[model samples]
Target chain A: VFSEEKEALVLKSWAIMKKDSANLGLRFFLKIFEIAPSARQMFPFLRDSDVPLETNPKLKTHAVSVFVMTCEAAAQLRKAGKITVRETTLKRLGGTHLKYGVADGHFEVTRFALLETIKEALPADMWGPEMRNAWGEAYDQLVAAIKQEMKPA
Target chain B: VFSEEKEALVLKSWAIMKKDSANLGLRFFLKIFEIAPSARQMFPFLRDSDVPLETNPKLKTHAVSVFVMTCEAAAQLRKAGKITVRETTLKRLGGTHLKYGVADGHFEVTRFALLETIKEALPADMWGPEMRNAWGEAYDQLVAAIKQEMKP
Candidate 1:
């Protein structure tokens, strides 16, 4: 509660990964493709650009921005610990995600990449059960907002 | 696990309490006397200083210092979550407490004054169950250290 639990773990781990967030962005985005290569069809920047997945400037720029946003949003949620009442990330993200036609499969692939990448990003000792649960909740918060927004009108 | 739990409650409440720490200390120290009148036996200044309880320079000086240390040490424990492995408040406090001949009853009395004073100092809304538990743990840490030092 004091910083020993979820907020602390999430905040500390995010802070650590955040130091290399730009590079981690590359790893994060690439993991998405690695999980489900077909999901790449959504991003026009990498399509036929002949820019390698690792070296694509557009991908790098977009990935870094999203990575920063994701980290900050998760960190922000630490204090309120609420999704619906807070005017939080999920609602906004849901709309943008829906506009881009991000489907359920893409969401799963994204979730896997995020958790896996974060797990690998932190030291093994820090990534134990408590850390796993904390980070999972953050990602879950992210996905929930997107899904909630994408729900039918 | 999140801020819904202990550290957050402790940190936030302490932050709030810390804002008025210098003054809150006067209340804290006075609360000590309010409960245990004879507890003042250890202090020579309280006897003949002719100083009012609220305005006593000696009391304020000693009280504020301990209060700050108590708050800061509690804050530091947020990260390590370990009092023993880390050089913590209780150990040194124990030695000083023993050297001064402070005893078990005094500790509980001090505990009462601290918790009660803190309860009054905080807003009623913020002084909920979670808040009580966290502050209790911190105070428990404080007493344990003093007791361990006093231990034969």
Candidate 2:
């Protein structure tokens, strides 16, 4: 229900990311495996027994190592003033999703799933005022950006 | 091995938080609880179960509702088009965290735990350049602001 409203979903997802990044990440990580074969085709290395480091211990840690390393990079970027999420990026991501026949409706799936995952992960008490403000604005901005980028088709 | 590097932890912690926000947030949350009783006090009402949600459903929902909203606000603040982190409200979180023990050493703990969390969290195939850059830069600026704010 909260996922239907743009600002609410945006706020909800970002809030989850803020408090339950690890858990959210785990879910995001898991979500990748569920991608279409076409999407999977984009990442050929995944065909291998190693590289990204699935739960399979038999595989080399190289993939898992890279996976963690990249996450580390994200952490670095956010903390050190390095990287940013841009309007162009959203447009591009929308475009990418479009290629997969992703419509505006699919956004709710991502948002709702993320919401459930985050709530399951973070401490219930961590939700509060500062977080709410952050989530609300983030939702508004992100929804505005997405609306602009999508153009209804 | 990672935890030994001490002096530059603020920046380092930021780096970690960027990659795995949940892990970083959890560590940060725990550190805050350790340092500031007032901030920690906000959680127990929900956790203890001694408080009944039947009469407190609204209260419970209201309480849980805040974390995401605050994050959204901070992200918007950070998103306000600053090319780099300045002494803005977005960066002032360290003072907030400090007020809440957020001891100096715990910053490093946040960093270490975050990296480990990411390793444990992300899917095997999803680890790639796009995600790395996204999460890395996120942590860098976030902690940098806090570190700057933490300055005596």
Candidate 3:
């Protein structure tokens, strides 16, 4: 699902994204909402928070952590190549995602927002075909890992 | 969409399980422990091994609560013709399962025990392909909705 060359590219770009994790996370989280307003309902924790979604601490906190986790998983794909997540991590993905009505569509939506968020964070020089391909494959590996443990949704 | 016929069929078989909820739950509960004795370590409620697994009131209580809820969700499955559940209810499933360290293998084991227990509950005539498929689909839906809330 990933390549040796592209793997390094993702790791290269991942360094930048990790620095401003809050902004990177918030931007990725917001991108999902911009494209799919209905997904707003999926995250009741954020939607039901006291303040606006944009300003809500809950939104930033959870989104950034998950963003970091997602990127972290993607970056490791080639190091392990085929991949083997800890059982606890994989099973947790299945259980929590189930409660969110998080379908395959949501994963795809996330993959898009994820890459775009990373793209914007990169210098224009760093944003090119190899890195794009790198991140895309990395995201696929991440999705494959999470979704393997995930139920039908 | 499920047929009006199988909807009633699942409802029909479910009626019998509801008739003896505690026993149904106990058999199902112990079945999981039987298959994976190691899983017993995960249950804080049943940790005092001096007490037998079935005799523990907390295990029985939680077991029955989950059994009824599982069957309840299944029947509710056909009602919606799709799947949806209370956010609060789904949240609790993730929380309790997480706190207890319910692994994917445990879910797989539970599915095996769930199906086997249900099959035994019904009379020979009621355990046909149609009824089996209905229950399986319902269980699958439950997993789908439940897994969506689960986080890594």
Whole-model lDDT values for every prediction: 0.72, 0.41, 0.75
The deviation in Å at residue B80 for candidate 1 is: 62
- DockQ, cand. 3: 0.01
Chain B TM-scores, listed for every candidate in order, come to 0.86, 0.40, 0.88
Off by over 4 Å in 3: A1-153, B82-88
Better of 2 and 3 by lDDT: 3
> For residues A41-144, what per-residue lDDT tens digits would candidate 2 score against the true structure?
33334555454434633322333342333333333332443322432366775566556565432343333333334445555775555444434333334445
- With candidate 2 superimposed using the best TM-score fit, by how many Å does residue A18's alpha carbon deviate from the native? 5.5
Q: What is the lDDT of candidate 2?
A: 0.41
What is the C-alpha lDDT profile of model 1 across B92-137, one tens digit per residue? 7677777878865566556656776788988898887677767777
Off by over 4 Å in 2: A1-23, A29-88, A127-144, B1-152
Best by TM-score: 3
Which regions in candidate 1 have their CA more than 4 angstroms from the true location? Answer: A1-4, A83-92, B1-152
Better of 1 and 3 by DockQ: 3
* C-alpha TM-score for every candidate: 0.46, 0.28, 0.47
Report the Cα lDDT for candidate 3.
0.75
